[PDB]
């Protein structure tokens, strides 16, 4: 019985899968092609676990999950036995996304809850949490993705149809908002920064209004460029939008039971692939 | 509701209520369709053809010499496949010819090399058009037409023979000139044609065609074979330009270009594309870019191989950015095919040092395990993968699976924690000395053997959990062993139970 898992994540080396469903449990599997052997079940949430997410193995085996009970739960495998080492629930509503930073930033976490907040939880020397939060969106935040870089930034997708790009500032000590972008007529479900250290940067912003805008910034200066992936509404509401590391392929999880794939061509416009 | 993101090992997990986990490990459909790529022997022999030098802006490998030729791939393909035709024709036009016999001066050499190349190209075209024309000769009902068709197969001798046999003797003699570029004969043939095409009550339809061939400009003309556009493969007519056409006066390139200027080729046809890139000479890249946005006849792999050959043979010129673009694209396709060694090899042909560094690093660390199996995987990590990167990656794989020599080559404290024998300690101390945290060093020095300072240092380290307690217990045991009055009391100032028993 597992009729509706909401999220699954793969580890750096892809040996250990972590699905999370609505029955609150987070199941850990030892994958091996056809055979993912169930190795664990983790019960510690008071509502459907929306998302799970491993951290960089530089930090051992850590997994921050966020669930409907408004609480972010950090887990850790310890000698082959899992244990909830920390927790961070400074959010007064259902926590939706949770995504670790680039490991060069430390062990930073990115939480994004319906109380219009998004936190960046550091784990200090005592391993204890150091929350520095910001208000992100009015009617709630559905997602928040990290950006790689070599001047840190992230993106957030809102319930007010916004897509925001925040940046760290030593003057403020809290992430200062630097640019917001408007293009959807309904809850911005998911937002994704692309890991392509190439000439430009790409953002795929899927939404409830069955659109997927792509914000391509020329460089550090010139603002973004709006590009409706295709100019027809998808047969059903879109949920997830993920970039590929090698290649800059875009995967779109629409509520129409297939996942589409879009690649950029020399026109600059995007074309299906599969 | 559905969910799907991309894997580290670029592949896709989606909601799937048919498995066991509630997700599906999908092997991403690879555009990379070319068999020999999945066989590791090809890759080994391909690395044998390269000279790798470290960069002048970082230690990461990038290619200094390549001897790859379109020629080389041909062994791994069927001589029957259209692919083989593409690679072969590409070899004929682009791979350098060698001329073994010594030549009086070097401009001569150049001329010979041109004749050789020309002869191979035209023999090949004849290989292709062969059956088309033979079919046409099968169906002709007129001898002079057959003679013409034999000229279409660049067979001057059988044209001459049939002429002879069909009692067309003068023509026969004339025919013998086809392929000597005698300008006298050229202007004479053209003259005869104008005289006919000004009065000339009637001339046989195929004799005029043959004269037009002798004219050296069979479409470029006023009795033009251009209308044969509708009766013959474009390649067949191009053969006519290349064989007759004005061989000596033109370079192979500008000749081919001359022909192409008279006829549009189908956008989708790739052997067409190769001729266009060959003829385009002065702006191959320009055309290549044009070819890119118009068709997909040239695949990712081919475009990369092409660009690389031309680059490393001085044959042609491509932007650092276009060569890198091609290289990225192919490396990516390869990585989608779980061909990490091969993607790694390709990634080295990057010009941009920064990007090479990132790509390489990222991939090696993410995929170290697979890249350390056979010797064909060894030569791989003996591309010039930086010592640092390899062991570093390997260090990561150990922390995550739960090493020390690599570390010797915070984290160090955690390693000491895990270690918590005497010989190993001594070796560690020697390594630390070679490298030259301080507290731990003081403790080690004490163990090998001021005492109060070492004690304070150790206490501070303990404060900075299980390993620290173990170290504290060890220190206590050592102190107890040493004891076996005021100074002793000063040094002193389950563990609690032990302390109580001591008091």
- Map residue A34 onto helix, strand or coil: coil
Of B2, B8, B354, the CB nearest to A255: B2
What does B251-289 look like in DSSP terms, one character per residue? -HHHHHHHHHTT-PPPTT-HHHHHHHHHHHGGGHHHHHH
User: Cβ(B338)–Cβ(B38) under 8 Å?
Assistant: no
Over its C-alpha atoms, chain A yields an Rg (Å, rounded) of 18
CA distance A171 to chain B (A): 29
Burial class of B84 by CB neighbour count within 10 A (0 to 12, 13 to 18, 19+): middle
Helix, strand counts (H, E) of chain B: 27, 5
B22, B298, B324: best to mutate for the A interface, most A CBs within 10 A? B22
Facing residue for B2 by CB, picked from A13, A61, A259: A259
CB contact under 8 A, A12 and B400: yes
Whole-angstrom distance between the N-terminal and C-terminal Cα of chain B? 69
Paired strand residues for A38: A29
Which of A14, A197, A255 is the closest to B8 by Cβ? Answer: A14
Whether A36 and B20 lie within 8 Å, measured CB to CB: yes
- Confirm if B276 and B248 have CB atoms less than 8 A apart: no
A259 vs B contacts (CB less than 8 Å): 2, 4, 12, 14
Most distant CA pair in chain A: distance in Å?
53
Q: Which residue has the tokens 């005698």?
A: B182
Q: Which two tokens stand for residue B5?
A: 């993101």
CB within 8 Å of B225: residues ≥ 6 apart: B209, B212, B218, B219, B237, B240
Query: Which residues in chain B are contacts of A202 at CB distance < 8 A?
Result: none
Beta carbons within 8 Å of A84's beta carbon, 6+ residues apart: A44, A73, A74, A75, A76
DSSP string, B320-344: HHHHHHHHHHHHHHHHHTT-HHHHH
Q: Tell me if A57 and B400 make a contact (CB, 8 A cut-off).
A: yes
Q: Mind spelling out the 3-state secondary structure of B198-210?
A: CCCCCCCHHHHHH
From B1, B289, B399, residue closest to A239, measured CB to CB: B1
In 3D, which of A127, A125, A209, A120 has the Cα closest to residue A160? A209
Closest CA to B211 of B233, B187, B235: B187
Contact A115, A74 (CB under 8 A): no
What are the beta bridge partners of residue B51? Answer: B65
User: Going by C-beta distance under 8 Å and a sequence separation of 6 or more, which residues neighbour residue B156?
Assistant: B175, B176, B178, B179
Helix axes B252-260, B270-280, angle to 10 degrees: 120
Short-list B321, B334, B266, B257, CA closest to B295: B266
Mutate to test the interface with B, among A52, A247, A250, A273 (most CBs of B within 10 A): A247
Q: Which residues of B touch A (CB under 8 A)?
A: 1-10, 12-15, 17, 19-23, 25, 29, 31, 289, 292-293, 328, 331-333, 335-336, 343, 354-355, 358, 362-363, 366, 369, 396-397, 399-400
For residue A142, give the nearest of A237, A2, A45 by alpha carbon: A237
Return the residue matching tokens 């006919």. Answer: B196
Q: How far apart are CA A255 and CA B1, in angstroms?
A: 5
Are B163 and B176 within 8 A, CB to CB? Answer: no
CB nearest to B336's CB, from A243, A246, A259:
A246
Instruction: Give the span between the Cα atoms of A189 and A6, in whole angstroms.
Output: 14
Angle subtended at Cα B362 by Cα A33 and Cα A175, rounded to the nearest 5 degrees: 110
Which two three-digit tokens encode residue B431? 């390594």
* CB spacing of A273 vs B31 below 8 angstroms: yes
Residues of A in contact with B293 (CB under 8 A): 266-267
Nearest to A247 among B5, B10, B29 (CB): B10
Contact B6 A57 (CB under 8 A): no
Integer angstrom CA distances of residue B498 from B455, B476, B481, B503:
18, 10, 14, 9
Angstrom distances, CA of residue B487 to CA of B389, B444, B451, B479, B492 = 51, 22, 11, 12, 9
Note whether A242 contacts B5, CB cutoff 8 Å.
yes
SS3 B169: helix
**What angle is formed at CA B447 by the lines to CA B441 and CA B453, rounded to 5 degrees?**
60
Residue with the two structure tokens 């999370």:
A20
The set of residues, in sequence order, having a beta carbon less than 8 Å from that of B149 and lying 6+ positions away, is B133, B136, B137, B140
Dist CA B496 CA A27 (whole Å) = 42
CB atoms within 10 A of CB B50: 18
Instruction: Say which residue the tokens 């002793």 belong to.
Output: B488
Query: Measured in whole angstroms, how far is the alpha carbon of residue A2 from the centre of its chain?
Result: 23
Contact B415, B393 (CB under 8 A): no
Is residue B100 classed as helix, strand or coil in its secondary structure? Answer: coil
The C-alpha angle with vertex B24 and arms to B22 and B30, in degrees rounded to 5, equals 165
Start-to-end C-alpha separation, chain A: 31
Instruction: Sort out which chain B residues have CB atoms less than 8 A from A2's CB and list them.
Output: 17, 21-22
Tell me if B464 sits within 8 A of B446, measured CB to CB.
no
Strands A72-77 and A82-88 come out as antiparallel
Size of chain B in residues: 503
A193/A179 Cα distance (integer angstroms): 14
CA distance B418 to B415: 5
Query: Which residue has 């609150």 as its token pair?
Result: A24
Pair of tokens at residue B132: 């088309």
User: Whole-angstrom Cα distance, residue A148 to residue B72?
Assistant: 40
Residue B158 in tokens: 């059988």
A65: left (phi over 0), alpha (psi -120 to 50) or beta: beta
For A109, the token pair is 């976490």
Neighbours of B187 (CB within 10 A): 12
Query: What is the arrangement of strands in the sheet containing A25-30, beginning at the earlier edge strand?
Result: A5-10, A16-21, A25-30, A37-43
Phi, psi dihedrals of residue B236, rounded to the nearest 5°? -55, -50
CB atoms within 10 A of CB B199: 6
Tokens representing A132 are 């520095």
CB hemisphere CA count around A53 (13 angstroms):
26
Provide the token pair at B334. Answer: 């390869």
Residue A273 and residue B332: Cβ atoms within 8 Å?
no
Tokens of A28: 């850990």
Strand order in the sheet with A250-254: A238-243, A250-254, A259-264, A270-272
Q: Which helix (H) or strand (E) holds A29?
A: strand A25-30
Please tell me which of the candidates B293, B343, B399 has its beta carbon nearest to residue A60: B399
Is the distance from CB of A88 to CB of A111 less than 8 angstroms?
yes
A251 contacts B10? CB cut-off 8 A: no
Cα Rg, chain B, nearest whole Å: 38
Beta-bridge partner residues of A217: A201
Q: B93-101: list long-range contacts, CB under 8 Å, 24+ apart.
A: B93/B117, B93/B121, B93/B274, B93/B275, B93/B278, B94/B70, B94/B278, B94/B306, B94/B309, B94/B310, B94/B313, B94/B315, B94/B316, B95/B69, B95/B70, B95/B71, B95/B309, B95/B313, B96/B313, B96/B315
Q: From the CA of A80, how many Å to the nearest CA of chain B?
A: 10
DSSP state of B180: B
Containing B274, the helix (H) or strand (E) segment is: helix B270-280
- Spell out which residues of chain B touch residue A10, defining contact as CB-CB under 8 Å: 7-9, 13
Decide if B327 contacts B304 (C-beta within 8 A).
Answer: yes
Residue at token pair 């020399």 = A266
Q: Report which secondary-structure segment, H or E, holds A99.
A: strand A95-100
Alpha-carbon distances of B75 from B72, B81, B87, B128, rounded to whole Å: 7, 12, 11, 20
HSE-CB for B261 with a 13 A CA cutoff: 12
Backbone φ, ψ for residue A251 (5° rounding) = -100, 125
CA B85 – CA B380 distance, rounded (Å): 31
DSSP secondary structure, B52-97, as one string: EEE-SSSS-EEEEEE---HHHHGGGS-TTSHHHHHHHHHHHHHSPP
Residues of chain A contacting B29 with CB distance shorter than 8 Å: 274
Q: How far is CA A244 from the centre of its chain?
A: 14
Centre a 10 Å sphere on the Cβ of residue A88 and count the other Cβ atoms it contains. 22
Mutate to test the interface with B, among A3, A12, A13 (most CBs of B within 10 A): A13
DSSP secondary structure, B362-421, as one string: HHHHHHTTTTSSSHHHHHHHTTT--HHHHHHHHHHHHHHH--HHHHH--HHHHHHHHH--
Residue A9 and residue A28 in contact, taking contact as beta carbons nearer than 8 Å = no
Distance CA B136, CA B95 (A): 34
Consecutive H or E run containing A69: none
Give φ, ψ of A120 to 5 degrees. -125, 95
Beta bridge partners of B255: none
**Which residues of chain B does A27 touch, with a Cβ-Cβ cutoff of 8 Å?**
21
Give the resolution value in Å. 23.0
HSE at residue B303, side-chain half, CA atoms within 13 A, is 27
Nearest partner of B252 among B132, B115, B373, judged by Cα: B115
C-beta atoms of B25 and A259 within 8 A: no
Interface contacts (A, B; CB < 8 Å): 125
Q: How many CB atoms lie within 10 A of CB A124?
A: 10
CA distance A185 to chain B (A): 20
Q: Which residue, among A17, A192, A245, A250, would best test binding to B if mutated, counting the most B CBs under 10 Å from its CB?
A: A245
Q: Which two tokens stand for residue B397?
A: 């794989």
Helix/strand/coil (H/E/C) assignment for every residue in B430-446: HHHHHHCCHHHHHHHHH
CA distance A241 to chain B (A): 7
The strand pair at B23-26 and A5-10 is best described as unpaired
Q: Which tokens hold the place of A46? A: 């008071």
Residues from chain B contacting residue A8 (CB–CB below 8 Å): 3, 13, 21-23
**Phi then psi dihedrals of residue A96, to 5 deg:** -100, -60
State residue A228 phi and psi, 5-degree precision.
-55, 100
Integer Cα distance of A201 and A220 in angstroms:
9
- Please provide residue B102's backbone torsions phi and psi, each rounded to the nearest 5 degrees: -65, 145
């Amino acid at each position: 019985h597992n009729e509706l898992i909401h999220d699954a994540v793969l580890d750096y080396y892809g040996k250990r899968l972590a699905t999370c469903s609505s029955d609150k449990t987070i199941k850990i599997f030892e994958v091996e092609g056809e055979t993912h052997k169930l190795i664990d079940t983790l019960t510690g949430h008071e509502g459907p676990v929306w998302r799970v997410d491993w951290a960089h193995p530089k930090f051992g085996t850590i997994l921050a999950s966020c669930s409907y009970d408004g609480k972010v739960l950090i887990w850790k495998e310890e000698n082959g036995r899992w244990s909830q080492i920390a927790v961070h629930a400074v959010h007064s509503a259902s926590v939706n996304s949770v995504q670790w930073a680039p490991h060069e930033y430390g062990p930073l976490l990115l939480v994004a809850s319906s109380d219009g907040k998004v936190s960046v939880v550091e784990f200090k020397e005592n391993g204890t949490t150091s929350p520095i939060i910001i208000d992100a969106h009015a009617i709630g935040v559905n997602s928040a993705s990290w950006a790689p870089a070599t001047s840190r930034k992230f993106v957030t997708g809102g319930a007010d149809n916004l897509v925001k790009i925040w940046k760290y500032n030593s003057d403020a000590q809290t992430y200062v908002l630097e640019s917001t972008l408007e293009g959807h007529s309904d809850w911005v479900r998911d937002v994704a920064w692309s890991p392509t250290v190439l000439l430009r940067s790409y953002l795929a912003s899927v939404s409830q209004d069955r659109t997927c805008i792509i914000w391509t910034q020329d460089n550090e200066q010139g603002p973004w460029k709006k590009t409706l992936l295709k100019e027809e509404k998808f047969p059903d509401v879109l949920w997830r939008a993920s970039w590929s590391l090698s290649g800059n392929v875009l995967a779109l999880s629409g509520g129409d039971n297939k996942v589409t794939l879009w690649k950029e061509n020399l026109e600059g416009k995007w074309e299906p692939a599969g | 509701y559905t969910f799907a993101k991309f894997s580290t090992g670029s592949m896709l997990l989606t909601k799937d209520i048919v498995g066991k986990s509630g997700v599906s490990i999908k092997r991403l459909p690879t555009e990379l369709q070319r068999k020999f790529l999945f066989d590791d022997v090809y890759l080994d022999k391909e690395i044998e053809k390269v000279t790798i030098e470290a960069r002048k802006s970082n230690p990461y490998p990038q290619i200094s010499e390549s001897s790859l030729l379109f020629k080389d791939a041909l062994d791994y393909m069927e001589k029957t496949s259209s692919d083989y035709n593409l690679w072969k024709l590409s070899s004929i036009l682009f791979d350098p010819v060698s001329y073994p016999y010594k030549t009086d001066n070097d401009q001569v050499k150049m001329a010979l090399l041109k004749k050789e190349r020309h002869c191979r190209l035209t023999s090949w075209i004849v290989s292709q058009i062969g059956p088309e024309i033979e079919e046409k000769i099968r169906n002709s009902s007129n001898e002079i037409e057959q003679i013409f068709l034999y000229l279409l197969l660049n067979d001057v001798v059988r044209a001459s023979k049939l002429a002879i046999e069909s009692k067309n003797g003068h023509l026969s003699v004339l025919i013998s000139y086809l392929g000597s570029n005698d300008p006298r004969i050229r202007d004479l043939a053209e003259l005869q044609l104008q005289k006919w095409s000004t009065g000339g009550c009637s001339i046989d339809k195929n004799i005029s065609k043959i004269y037009k061939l002798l004219s050296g400009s069979p479409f470029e003309g006023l009795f033009s074979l251009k209308e044969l556009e509708s009766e013959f493969s474009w390649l067949c007519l191009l053969n006519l330009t290349l064989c007759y056409g004005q061989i000596d006066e033109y370079s192979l390139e500008s000749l081919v270009q001359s022909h192409l200027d008279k006829f549009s080729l189908p956008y989708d046809d790739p052997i067409g594309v190769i001729f266009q890139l060959y003829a385009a000479n002065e702006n191959t890249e320009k055309l290549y870019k044009e070819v890119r946005q118009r068709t997909n006849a040239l695949d990712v792999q081919f475009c990369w191989y092409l660009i690389q050959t031309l680059r490393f043979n001085g044959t042609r010129v491509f932007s650092k950015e276009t060569s890198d673009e091609a290289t990225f694209a192919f490396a990516a396709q390869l990585e989608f095919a779980q061909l990490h060694g091969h993607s790694l090899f390709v990634s080295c042909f990057l010009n941009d040092d920064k990007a090479a560094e990132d790509t390489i690093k990222r991939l090696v660390m993410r995929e170290i395990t697979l890249l350390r199996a056979s010797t064909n995987d060894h030569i791989l990590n003996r591309l010039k993968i930086p010592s640092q990167l390899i062991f570093n990656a390997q260090a990561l794989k150990d922390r995550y699976e739960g090493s020390e020599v690599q570390n010797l080559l915070d984290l160090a404290e955690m390693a000491i924690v895990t270690s918590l024998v005497q010989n190993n300690e001594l070796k560690t101390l020697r390594e630390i000395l070679n490298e030259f945290v301080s507290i731990n060093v003081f403790e080690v020095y004490l163990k090998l053997v001021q005492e109060t300072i070492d004690s304070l240092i150790s206490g501070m380290k303990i404060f900075y959990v299980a390993a620290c307690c173990n170290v504290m217990s060890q220190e206590i045991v050592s102190k107890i062993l040493e004891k076996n009055k005021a100074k002793l009391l000063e040094l002193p100032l389950q563990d609690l139970m032990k302390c109580t028993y001591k008091i």
